[PDB]
Amino acid sequence: GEWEIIDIGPFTQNLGKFAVDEENKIGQYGRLTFNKVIRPCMKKTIQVPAGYEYQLYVYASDKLFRADISEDYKTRGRKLLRFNGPVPPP
């Protein structure tokens, strides 16, 4: 799966911040500085493992990236699935 747009408040901004920290631990992009998550943010319910997947547009160091994140309900664990950029603005 079910798909839903969510707004860009503190919860979403910390998803954006999470993707940038993870990327900085991987190191395939230059060192990034989190700027902001912008609309639109898609949330997809995941049945197994129970949780959610978020698709985000996040500015970091004034470049625009796409980030995919998984969140497991059982532990509040976050995994960075995808991080590409720069992308065109939505």
Side-chain angles (χ1 to χ4, degrees):
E2 177 81 351
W3 296 94
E4 160 195 7
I5 289 181
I6 60 173
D7 209 73
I8 49 166
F11 179 78
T12 306
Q13 295 302 324
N14 283 126
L15 281 171
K17 183 169 192 59
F18 165 85
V20 168
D21 299 319
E22 288 305 284
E23 174 56 48
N24 277 327
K25 266 134 57 151
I26 300 171
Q28 306 188 322
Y29 292 91
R31 275 67 159 256
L32 294 179
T33 300
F34 172 77
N35 302 152
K36 69 191 163 171
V37 178
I38 69 182
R39 287 176 195 97
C41 186
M42 299 150 76
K43 171 194 210 168
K44 165 203 179 175
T45 299
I46 298 284
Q47 306 294 328
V48 182
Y52 297 99
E53 197 195 320
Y54 305 89
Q55 296 209 346
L56 272 67
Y57 279 96
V58 57
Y59 275 119
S61 308
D62 310 331
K63 296 242 155 242
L64 187 66
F65 311 83
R66 272 269 290 125
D68 283 356
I69 300 147
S70 73
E71 207 192 352
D72 107 272
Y73 245 169
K74 227 135 119 118
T75 292
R76 102 201 267 83
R78 273 168 188 190
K79 182 69 174 60
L80 177 68
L81 306 175
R82 290 164 188 170
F83 195 102
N84 314 273
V87 286

mmCIF file with all atom_site columns, all heavy atoms in Angstrom, residues 48-67:
data_model
loop_
_atom_site.group_PDB
_atom_site.id
_atom_site.type_symbol
_atom_site.label_atom_id
_atom_site.label_alt_id
_atom_site.label_comp_id
_atom_site.label_asym_id
_atom_site.label_entity_id
_atom_site.label_seq_id
_atom_site.pdbx_PDB_ins_code
_atom_site.Cartn_x
_atom_site.Cartn_y
_atom_site.Cartn_z
_atom_site.occupancy
_atom_site.B_iso_or_equiv
_atom_site.pdbx_formal_charge
_atom_site.auth_seq_id
_atom_site.auth_comp_id
_atom_site.auth_asym_id
_atom_site.auth_atom_id
_atom_site.pdbx_PDB_model_num
ATOM 1   N N   . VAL A 1 48 ? 6.117  -8.276  5.285  1.00 0.00 ? 48 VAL A N   1
ATOM 2   C CA  . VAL A 1 48 ? 7.207  -9.121  5.756  1.00 0.00 ? 48 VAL A CA  1
ATOM 3   C C   . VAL A 1 48 ? 8.518  -8.586  5.192  1.00 0.00 ? 48 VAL A C   1
ATOM 4   O O   . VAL A 1 48 ? 8.681  -8.586  3.967  1.00 0.00 ? 48 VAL A O   1
ATOM 5   C CB  . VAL A 1 48 ? 7.010  -10.582 5.350  1.00 0.00 ? 48 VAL A CB  1
ATOM 6   C CG1 . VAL A 1 48 ? 8.169  -11.416 5.928  1.00 0.00 ? 48 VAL A CG1 1
ATOM 7   C CG2 . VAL A 1 48 ? 5.630  -11.081 5.806  1.00 0.00 ? 48 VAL A CG2 1
ATOM 8   N N   . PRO A 1 49 ? 9.475  -8.130  6.022  1.00 0.00 ? 49 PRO A N   1
ATOM 9   C CA  . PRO A 1 49 ? 9.275  -8.032  7.477  1.00 0.00 ? 49 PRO A CA  1
ATOM 10  C C   . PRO A 1 49 ? 8.421  -6.847  7.748  1.00 0.00 ? 49 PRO A C   1
ATOM 11  O O   . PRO A 1 49 ? 8.598  -5.829  7.060  1.00 0.00 ? 49 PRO A O   1
ATOM 12  C CB  . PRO A 1 49 ? 10.680 -7.826  8.043  1.00 0.00 ? 49 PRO A CB  1
ATOM 13  C CG  . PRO A 1 49 ? 11.605 -8.258  6.928  1.00 0.00 ? 49 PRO A CG  1
ATOM 14  C CD  . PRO A 1 49 ? 10.882 -7.965  5.641  1.00 0.00 ? 49 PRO A CD  1
ATOM 15  N N   . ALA A 1 50 ? 7.536  -6.979  8.729  1.00 0.00 ? 50 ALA A N   1
ATOM 16  C CA  . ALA A 1 50 ? 6.548  -5.952  8.981  1.00 0.00 ? 50 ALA A CA  1
ATOM 17  C C   . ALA A 1 50 ? 7.232  -4.605  9.155  1.00 0.00 ? 50 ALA A C   1
ATOM 18  O O   . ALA A 1 50 ? 8.219  -4.480  9.885  1.00 0.00 ? 50 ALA A O   1
ATOM 19  C CB  . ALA A 1 50 ? 5.698  -6.323  10.199 1.00 0.00 ? 50 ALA A CB  1
ATOM 20  N N   . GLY A 1 51 ? 6.761  -3.619  8.409  1.00 0.00 ? 51 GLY A N   1
ATOM 21  C CA  . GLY A 1 51 ? 7.337  -2.302  8.536  1.00 0.00 ? 51 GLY A CA  1
ATOM 22  C C   . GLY A 1 51 ? 6.937  -1.377  7.425  1.00 0.00 ? 51 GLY A C   1
ATOM 23  O O   . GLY A 1 51 ? 5.794  -1.408  6.952  1.00 0.00 ? 51 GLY A O   1
ATOM 24  N N   . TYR A 1 52 ? 7.886  -0.545  6.997  1.00 0.00 ? 52 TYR A N   1
ATOM 25  C CA  . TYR A 1 52 ? 7.618  0.407   5.937  1.00 0.00 ? 52 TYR A CA  1
ATOM 26  C C   . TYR A 1 52 ? 8.854  0.626   5.090  1.00 0.00 ? 52 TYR A C   1
ATOM 27  O O   . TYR A 1 52 ? 9.997  0.498   5.550  1.00 0.00 ? 52 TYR A O   1
ATOM 28  C CB  . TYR A 1 52 ? 7.135  1.735   6.501  1.00 0.00 ? 52 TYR A CB  1
ATOM 29  C CG  . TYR A 1 52 ? 5.847  1.585   7.227  1.00 0.00 ? 52 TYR A CG  1
ATOM 30  C CD1 . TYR A 1 52 ? 5.823  1.481   8.607  1.00 0.00 ? 52 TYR A CD1 1
ATOM 31  C CD2 . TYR A 1 52 ? 4.648  1.480   6.534  1.00 0.00 ? 52 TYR A CD2 1
ATOM 32  C CE1 . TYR A 1 52 ? 4.643  1.333   9.281  1.00 0.00 ? 52 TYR A CE1 1
ATOM 33  C CE2 . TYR A 1 52 ? 3.456  1.329   7.205  1.00 0.00 ? 52 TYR A CE2 1
ATOM 34  C CZ  . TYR A 1 52 ? 3.466  1.259   8.586  1.00 0.00 ? 52 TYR A CZ  1
ATOM 35  O OH  . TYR A 1 52 ? 2.295  1.104   9.287  1.00 0.00 ? 52 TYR A OH  1
ATOM 36  N N   . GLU A 1 53 ? 8.600  1.030   3.855  1.00 0.00 ? 53 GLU A N   1
ATOM 37  C CA  . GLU A 1 53 ? 9.636  1.466   2.948  1.00 0.00 ? 53 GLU A CA  1
ATOM 38  C C   . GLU A 1 53 ? 9.307  2.890   2.513  1.00 0.00 ? 53 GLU A C   1
ATOM 39  O O   . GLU A 1 53 ? 8.172  3.188   2.117  1.00 0.00 ? 53 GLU A O   1
ATOM 40  C CB  . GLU A 1 53 ? 9.731  0.531   1.738  1.00 0.00 ? 53 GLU A CB  1
ATOM 41  C CG  . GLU A 1 53 ? 11.024 0.646   0.951  1.00 0.00 ? 53 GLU A CG  1
ATOM 42  C CD  . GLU A 1 53 ? 10.915 -0.014  -0.422 1.00 0.00 ? 53 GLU A CD  1
ATOM 43  O OE1 . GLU A 1 53 ? 10.299 -1.101  -0.494 1.00 0.00 ? 53 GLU A OE1 1
ATOM 44  O OE2 . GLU A 1 53 ? 11.406 0.575   -1.428 1.00 0.00 ? 53 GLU A OE2 1
ATOM 45  N N   . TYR A 1 54 ? 10.286 3.770   2.607  1.00 0.00 ? 54 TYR A N   1
ATOM 46  C CA  . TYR A 1 54 ? 10.116 5.157   2.227  1.00 0.00 ? 54 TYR A CA  1
ATOM 47  C C   . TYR A 1 54 ? 10.977 5.460   1.007  1.00 0.00 ? 54 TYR A C   1
ATOM 48  O O   . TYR A 1 54 ? 12.133 5.033   0.926  1.00 0.00 ? 54 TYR A O   1
ATOM 49  C CB  . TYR A 1 54 ? 10.512 6.093   3.363  1.00 0.00 ? 54 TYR A CB  1
ATOM 50  C CG  . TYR A 1 54 ? 9.803  5.846   4.662  1.00 0.00 ? 54 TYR A CG  1
ATOM 51  C CD1 . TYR A 1 54 ? 10.322 4.942   5.586  1.00 0.00 ? 54 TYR A CD1 1
ATOM 52  C CD2 . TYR A 1 54 ? 8.622  6.533   4.992  1.00 0.00 ? 54 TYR A CD2 1
ATOM 53  C CE1 . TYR A 1 54 ? 9.691  4.720   6.788  1.00 0.00 ? 54 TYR A CE1 1
ATOM 54  C CE2 . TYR A 1 54 ? 7.975  6.316   6.216  1.00 0.00 ? 54 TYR A CE2 1
ATOM 55  C CZ  . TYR A 1 54 ? 8.526  5.408   7.105  1.00 0.00 ? 54 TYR A CZ  1
ATOM 56  O OH  . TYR A 1 54 ? 7.926  5.168   8.322  1.00 0.00 ? 54 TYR A OH  1
ATOM 57  N N   . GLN A 1 55 ? 10.389 6.176   0.062  1.00 0.00 ? 55 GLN A N   1
ATOM 58  C CA  . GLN A 1 55 ? 11.087 6.765   -1.070 1.00 0.00 ? 55 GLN A CA  1
ATOM 59  C C   . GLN A 1 55 ? 11.077 8.285   -0.901 1.00 0.00 ? 55 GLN A C   1
ATOM 60  O O   . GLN A 1 55 ? 10.005 8.906   -0.870 1.00 0.00 ? 55 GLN A O   1
ATOM 61  C CB  . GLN A 1 55 ? 10.439 6.363   -2.390 1.00 0.00 ? 55 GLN A CB  1
ATOM 62  C CG  . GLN A 1 55 ? 10.493 4.888   -2.730 1.00 0.00 ? 55 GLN A CG  1
ATOM 63  C CD  . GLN A 1 55 ? 10.503 4.690   -4.248 1.00 0.00 ? 55 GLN A CD  1
ATOM 64  O OE1 . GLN A 1 55 ? 10.213 5.621   -5.000 1.00 0.00 ? 55 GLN A OE1 1
ATOM 65  N NE2 . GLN A 1 55 ? 10.856 3.497   -4.700 1.00 0.00 ? 55 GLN A NE2 1
ATOM 66  N N   . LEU A 1 56 ? 12.273 8.865   -0.804 1.00 0.00 ? 56 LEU A N   1
ATOM 67  C CA  . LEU A 1 56 ? 12.543 10.239  -0.408 1.00 0.00 ? 56 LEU A CA  1
ATOM 68  C C   . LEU A 1 56 ? 13.332 10.970  -1.482 1.00 0.00 ? 56 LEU A C   1
ATOM 69  O O   . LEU A 1 56 ? 14.153 10.378  -2.200 1.00 0.00 ? 56 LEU A O   1
ATOM 70  C CB  . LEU A 1 56 ? 13.413 10.316  0.869  1.00 0.00 ? 56 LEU A CB  1
ATOM 71  C CG  . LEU A 1 56 ? 12.819 10.311  2.262  1.00 0.00 ? 56 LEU A CG  1
ATOM 72  C CD1 . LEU A 1 56 ? 12.192 8.979   2.540  1.00 0.00 ? 56 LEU A CD1 1
ATOM 73  C CD2 . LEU A 1 56 ? 13.898 10.603  3.237  1.00 0.00 ? 56 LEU A CD2 1
ATOM 74  N N   . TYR A 1 57 ? 13.104 12.271  -1.554 1.00 0.00 ? 57 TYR A N   1
ATOM 75  C CA  . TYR A 1 57 ? 13.952 13.209  -2.280 1.00 0.00 ? 57 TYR A CA  1
ATOM 76  C C   . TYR A 1 57 ? 14.683 14.059  -1.251 1.00 0.00 ? 57 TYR A C   1
ATOM 77  O O   . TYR A 1 57 ? 14.051 14.836  -0.524 1.00 0.00 ? 57 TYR A O   1
ATOM 78  C CB  . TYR A 1 57 ? 13.101 14.093  -3.165 1.00 0.00 ? 57 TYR A CB  1
ATOM 79  C CG  . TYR A 1 57 ? 12.681 13.522  -4.465 1.00 0.00 ? 57 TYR A CG  1
ATOM 80  C CD1 . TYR A 1 57 ? 11.445 12.916  -4.611 1.00 0.00 ? 57 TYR A CD1 1
ATOM 81  C CD2 . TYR A 1 57 ? 13.495 13.632  -5.564 1.00 0.00 ? 57 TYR A CD2 1
ATOM 82  C CE1 . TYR A 1 57 ? 11.038 12.420  -5.833 1.00 0.00 ? 57 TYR A CE1 1
ATOM 83  C CE2 . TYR A 1 57 ? 13.104 13.149  -6.791 1.00 0.00 ? 57 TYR A CE2 1
ATOM 84  C CZ  . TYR A 1 57 ? 11.874 12.547  -6.922 1.00 0.00 ? 57 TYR A CZ  1
ATOM 85  O OH  . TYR A 1 57 ? 11.508 12.073  -8.162 1.00 0.00 ? 57 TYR A OH  1
ATOM 86  N N   . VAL A 1 58 ? 16.003 13.932  -1.179 1.00 0.00 ? 58 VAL A N   1
ATOM 87  C CA  . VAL A 1 58 ? 16.760 14.619  -0.147 1.00 0.00 ? 58 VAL A CA  1
ATOM 88  C C   . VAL A 1 58 ? 17.871 15.431  -0.798 1.00 0.00 ? 58 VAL A C   1
ATOM 89  O O   . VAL A 1 58 ? 18.646 14.904  -1.600 1.00 0.00 ? 58 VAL A O   1
ATOM 90  C CB  . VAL A 1 58 ? 17.333 13.637  0.891  1.00 0.00 ? 58 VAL A CB  1
ATOM 91  C CG1 . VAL A 1 58 ? 18.202 12.587  0.207  1.00 0.00 ? 58 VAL A CG1 1
ATOM 92  C CG2 . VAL A 1 58 ? 18.112 14.393  1.959  1.00 0.00 ? 58 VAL A CG2 1
ATOM 93  N N   . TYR A 1 59 ? 17.941 16.711  -0.447 1.00 0.00 ? 59 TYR A N   1
ATOM 94  C CA  . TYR A 1 59 ? 19.065 17.563  -0.801 1.00 0.00 ? 59 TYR A CA  1
ATOM 95  C C   . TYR A 1 59 ? 20.171 17.348  0.214  1.00 0.00 ? 59 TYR A C   1
ATOM 96  O O   . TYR A 1 59 ? 19.938 17.415  1.425  1.00 0.00 ? 59 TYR A O   1
ATOM 97  C CB  . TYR A 1 59 ? 18.661 19.032  -0.777 1.00 0.00 ? 59 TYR A CB  1
ATOM 98  C CG  . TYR A 1 59 ? 18.018 19.587  -2.018 1.00 0.00 ? 59 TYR A CG  1
ATOM 99  C CD1 . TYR A 1 59 ? 16.732 20.097  -1.991 1.00 0.00 ? 59 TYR A CD1 1
ATOM 100 C CD2 . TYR A 1 59 ? 18.710 19.643  -3.208 1.00 0.00 ? 59 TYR A CD2 1
ATOM 101 C CE1 . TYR A 1 59 ? 16.137 20.617  -3.144 1.00 0.00 ? 59 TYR A CE1 1
ATOM 102 C CE2 . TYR A 1 59 ? 18.142 20.159  -4.331 1.00 0.00 ? 59 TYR A CE2 1
ATOM 103 C CZ  . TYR A 1 59 ? 16.868 20.657  -4.300 1.00 0.00 ? 59 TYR A CZ  1
ATOM 104 O OH  . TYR A 1 59 ? 16.335 21.179  -5.458 1.00 0.00 ? 59 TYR A OH  1
ATOM 105 N N   . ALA A 1 60 ? 21.372 17.099  -0.281 1.00 0.00 ? 60 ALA A N   1
ATOM 106 C CA  . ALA A 1 60 ? 22.563 17.005  0.543  1.00 0.00 ? 60 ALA A CA  1
ATOM 107 C C   . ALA A 1 60 ? 23.676 17.698  -0.228 1.00 0.00 ? 60 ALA A C   1
ATOM 108 O O   . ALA A 1 60 ? 23.835 17.441  -1.428 1.00 0.00 ? 60 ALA A O   1
ATOM 109 C CB  . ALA A 1 60 ? 22.917 15.545  0.836  1.00 0.00 ? 60 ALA A CB  1
ATOM 110 N N   . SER A 1 61 ? 24.380 18.626  0.440  1.00 0.00 ? 61 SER A N   1
ATOM 111 C CA  . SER A 1 61 ? 25.383 19.482  -0.210 1.00 0.00 ? 61 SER A CA  1
ATOM 112 C C   . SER A 1 61 ? 24.832 20.097  -1.497 1.00 0.00 ? 61 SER A C   1
ATOM 113 O O   . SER A 1 61 ? 25.485 20.078  -2.546 1.00 0.00 ? 61 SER A O   1
ATOM 114 C CB  . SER A 1 61 ? 26.667 18.704  -0.501 1.00 0.00 ? 61 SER A CB  1
ATOM 115 O OG  . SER A 1 61 ? 27.114 18.062  0.687  1.00 0.00 ? 61 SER A OG  1
ATOM 116 N N   . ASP A 1 62 ? 23.592 20.595  -1.435 1.00 0.00 ? 62 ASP A N   1
ATOM 117 C CA  . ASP A 1 62 ? 22.939 21.270  -2.556 1.00 0.00 ? 62 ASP A CA  1
ATOM 118 C C   . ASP A 1 62 ? 22.812 20.396  -3.807 1.00 0.00 ? 62 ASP A C   1
ATOM 119 O O   . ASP A 1 62 ? 22.550 20.908  -4.902 1.00 0.00 ? 62 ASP A O   1
ATOM 120 C CB  . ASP A 1 62 ? 23.649 22.579  -2.902 1.00 0.00 ? 62 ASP A CB  1
ATOM 121 C CG  . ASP A 1 62 ? 23.872 23.446  -1.687 1.00 0.00 ? 62 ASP A CG  1
ATOM 122 O OD1 . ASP A 1 62 ? 23.042 23.339  -0.752 1.00 0.00 ? 62 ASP A OD1 1
ATOM 123 O OD2 . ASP A 1 62 ? 24.818 24.272  -1.704 1.00 0.00 ? 62 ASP A OD2 1
ATOM 124 N N   . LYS A 1 63 ? 22.979 19.086  -3.690 1.00 0.00 ? 63 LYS A N   1
ATOM 125 C CA  . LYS A 1 63 ? 22.675 18.180  -4.784 1.00 0.00 ? 63 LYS A CA  1
ATOM 126 C C   . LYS A 1 63 ? 21.415 17.421  -4.386 1.00 0.00 ? 63 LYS A C   1
ATOM 127 O O   . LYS A 1 63 ? 21.122 17.267  -3.194 1.00 0.00 ? 63 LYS A O   1
ATOM 128 C CB  . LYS A 1 63 ? 23.819 17.186  -5.048 1.00 0.00 ? 63 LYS A CB  1
ATOM 129 C CG  . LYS A 1 63 ? 25.119 17.827  -5.523 1.00 0.00 ? 63 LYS A CG  1
ATOM 130 C CD  . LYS A 1 63 ? 25.530 17.364  -6.899 1.00 0.00 ? 63 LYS A CD  1
ATOM 131 C CE  . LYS A 1 63 ? 26.408 18.400  -7.580 1.00 0.00 ? 63 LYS A CE  1
ATOM 132 N NZ  . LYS A 1 63 ? 25.770 18.904  -8.826 1.00 0.00 ? 63 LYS A NZ  1
ATOM 133 N N   . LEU A 1 64 ? 20.652 16.962  -5.373 1.00 0.00 ? 64 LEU A N   1
ATOM 134 C CA  . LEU A 1 64 ? 19.405 16.263  -5.092 1.00 0.00 ? 64 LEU A CA  1
ATOM 135 C C   . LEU A 1 64 ? 19.587 14.778  -5.336 1.00 0.00 ? 64 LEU A C   1
ATOM 136 O O   . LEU A 1 64 ? 19.966 14.366  -6.437 1.00 0.00 ? 64 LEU A O   1
ATOM 137 C CB  . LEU A 1 64 ? 18.243 16.807  -5.934 1.00 0.00 ? 64 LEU A CB  1
ATOM 138 C CG  . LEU A 1 64 ? 16.824 16.278  -5.645 1.00 0.00 ? 64 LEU A CG  1
ATOM 139 C CD1 . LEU A 1 64 ? 16.266 16.682  -4.242 1.00 0.00 ? 64 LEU A CD1 1
ATOM 140 C CD2 . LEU A 1 64 ? 15.846 16.652  -6.786 1.00 0.00 ? 64 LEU A CD2 1
ATOM 141 N N   . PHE A 1 65 ? 19.227 13.980  -4.340 1.00 0.00 ? 65 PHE A N   1
ATOM 142 C CA  . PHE A 1 65 ? 19.329 12.533  -4.434 1.00 0.00 ? 65 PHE A CA  1
ATOM 143 C C   . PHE A 1 65 ? 17.969 11.885  -4.192 1.00 0.00 ? 65 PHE A C   1
ATOM 144 O O   . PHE A 1 65 ? 17.052 12.489  -3.627 1.00 0.00 ? 65 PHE A O   1
ATOM 145 C CB  . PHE A 1 65 ? 20.341 11.979  -3.435 1.00 0.00 ? 65 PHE A CB  1
ATOM 146 C CG  . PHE A 1 65 ? 21.676 12.695  -3.439 1.00 0.00 ? 65 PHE A CG  1
ATOM 147 C CD1 . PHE A 1 65 ? 21.848 13.873  -2.721 1.00 0.00 ? 65 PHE A CD1 1
ATOM 148 C CD2 . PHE A 1 65 ? 22.753 12.183  -4.146 1.00 0.00 ? 65 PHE A CD2 1
ATOM 149 C CE1 . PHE A 1 65 ? 23.053 14.528  -2.689 1.00 0.00 ? 65 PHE A CE1 1
ATOM 150 C CE2 . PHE A 1 65 ? 23.969 12.826  -4.131 1.00 0.00 ? 65 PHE A CE2 1
ATOM 151 C CZ  . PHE A 1 65 ? 24.125 14.009  -3.402 1.00 0.00 ? 65 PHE A CZ  1
ATOM 152 N N   . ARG A 1 66 ? 17.845 10.654  -4.667 1.00 0.00 ? 66 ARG A N   1
ATOM 153 C CA  . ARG A 1 66 ? 16.743 9.758   -4.339 1.00 0.00 ? 66 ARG A CA  1
ATOM 154 C C   . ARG A 1 66 ? 17.244 8.728   -3.338 1.00 0.00 ? 66 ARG A C   1
ATOM 155 O O   . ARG A 1 66 ? 18.338 8.170   -3.509 1.00 0.00 ? 66 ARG A O   1
ATOM 156 C CB  . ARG A 1 66 ? 16.203 9.066   -5.589 1.00 0.00 ? 66 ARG A CB  1
ATOM 157 C CG  . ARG A 1 66 ? 15.127 9.886   -6.262 1.00 0.00 ? 66 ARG A CG  1
ATOM 158 C CD  . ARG A 1 66 ? 13.745 9.510   -5.746 1.00 0.00 ? 66 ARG A CD  1
ATOM 159 N NE  . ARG A 1 66 ? 13.376 8.181   -6.215 1.00 0.00 ? 66 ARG A NE  1
ATOM 160 C CZ  . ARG A 1 66 ? 13.005 7.178   -5.425 1.00 0.00 ? 66 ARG A CZ  1
ATOM 161 N NH1 . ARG A 1 66 ? 12.966 7.345   -4.105 1.00 0.00 ? 66 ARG A NH1 1
ATOM 162 N NH2 . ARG A 1 66 ? 12.692 6.004   -5.963 1.00 0.00 ? 66 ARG A NH2 1
ATOM 163 N N   . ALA A 1 67 ? 16.468 8.506   -2.276 1.00 0.00 ? 67 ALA A N   1
ATOM 164 C CA  . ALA A 1 67 ? 16.821 7.530   -1.255 1.00 0.00 ? 67 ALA A CA  1
ATOM 165 C C   . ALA A 1 67 ? 15.642 6.607   -0.967 1.00 0.00 ? 67 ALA A C   1
ATOM 166 O O   . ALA A 1 67 ? 14.490 7.048   -0.912 1.00 0.00 ? 67 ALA A O   1
ATOM 167 C CB  . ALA A 1 67 ? 17.289 8.226   0.016  1.00 0.00 ? 67 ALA A CB  1
#
